[PDB]
Amino acid sequence: IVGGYTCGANTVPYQVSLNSGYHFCGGSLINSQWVVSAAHCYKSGIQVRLGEDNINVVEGNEQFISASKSIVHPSYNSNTLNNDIMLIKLKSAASLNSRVASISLPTSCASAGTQCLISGWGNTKSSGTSYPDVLKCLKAPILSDSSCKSAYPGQITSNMFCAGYLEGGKDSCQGDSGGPVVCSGKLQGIVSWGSGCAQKNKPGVYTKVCNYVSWIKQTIASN
Ligand SMILES: [Ca+2]
């Protein structure tokens, strides 16, 4: 997260870190057994780390649970990032309390102008590289479809939306991938892609979770 703030420990209780020997992506806990992330975060041997603040220090609220199975969206295209969503099942159910909690799925899509909270452990610099240990947060609005398409001609599908600031300076970034965009207590987006980070006229692009609720529910019901 570039141009954000320190969230505060366990203030974003649905935020998870995906670990394969190291943090590599965010994700969102959606029930005791299941995490939503980006398909571009797929790999084998994922451990899901819940209850994290400092990802390099055991601070007392962590739950580390290996994934039993990952399901990339059936229509994910890694070239275009269309359908950049993946479900991860935990081998055991997480213990839920106020520091580790699921986030609700949307019942309706969000509109441009809605304010959201984006979070993660990704790079905090727009030029060069600095990875934080503690969770970072950014409040940002959803942008109009027209501004999003104008920013990224030929690239924005109906399964994507832009959020952030066209002036630059405030965005998600590498290592935030897969993490949440939450608006009015609903998971509306997944950190997906963008050109660089926090660049002028190049906002963040996010998977439009409301399009996937049917798929998520039916997949959980049968897996
Ligand atoms: Ca920790």
Nearest-angstrom CA–CA distance, 154 and 76: 18
Q: Which amino acid is at 18?
A: L
Nearest-angstrom CA–CA distance, 169 and 200: 8
SS3 41: helix
Annotated binding site for Ca(2+): 52, 54, 57, 62
Under DSSP, the state recorded for 100 is B
Task: Tell me the structure's resolution in angstroms, rounded to a single decimal.
Answer: 1.3
Query: Is 195 tagged catalytic?
Result: no
Query: 3 CA to middle of ligand 1, Å?
Result: 23
Question: Which phi and psi angles does 151 have, rounded to 5°?
Answer: -70, -35
Could you tell me the two tokens for 113?
A: 């102008």
Beta strands 23-29; 63-72: pairing state: unpaired
Query: Is 177 tagged catalytic?
Result: yes
Query: Is 145 tagged catalytic?
Result: no
Describe the strand order of the beta sheet including 136-141 as a list of residue ranges.
5-6, 136-141, 115-120, 180-183, 186-193, 204-208, 160-163
Query: 55 CA to middle of ligand 1, Å?
Result: 4
Q: Is 162 left (phi over 0), alpha (psi -120 to 50) or beta?
A: beta
Nearest-angstrom CA–CA distance, 127 and 104: 35
CA atoms 48, 33, 110, 7: torsion sign:
negative
User: Which of 40, 70, 119, 176 is labelled catalytic?
Assistant: 40
Annotated binding site: 52, 54, 57, 62, 171-172, 174-175, 177
Under DSSP, the state recorded for 89 is E
Question: How was it solved?
Answer: X-ray
What Rg do the C-alpha atoms of the chain give, in angstroms? 16
User: Which of 23, 53, 73, 84 is labelled catalytic?
Assistant: 84
Q: Where are the domains of the chain?
A: 1-12+103-210, 13-102+211-222
Using CA atoms, how far residue 15 sits from 39, 79, 221, 223, in Å, is 17, 27, 23, 22
Query: 13 CA to middle of ligand 1, Å?
Result: 13
CATH number of the domain at 13-102+211-222, please? 2.40.10.10
Q: Could you say which architecture CATH assigns to the domain 1-12+103-210?
A: Beta Barrel (2.40)
| 1-12+103-210 and 13-102+211-222: identical CATH topology | yes
Per the CB < 8 A criterion, the answer to whether 209 and 86 are in contact is no
Query: 40 CA to middle of ligand 1, Å?
Result: 24
The DSSP string of 126-190 is SSS----SS-EEEEEEBPPHHHHHHHSTTT--TTEEEES-TTSS-B--TTTTT-EEEETTEEEEE
Residue 90, class by beta-carbon neighbours within 10 Å (0-12 exposed, 13-18 middle, 19+ buried)?
Answer: buried
Query: 116 CA to middle of ligand 1, Å?
Result: 25
Annotated binding site for substrate: 171-172, 174-175, 177
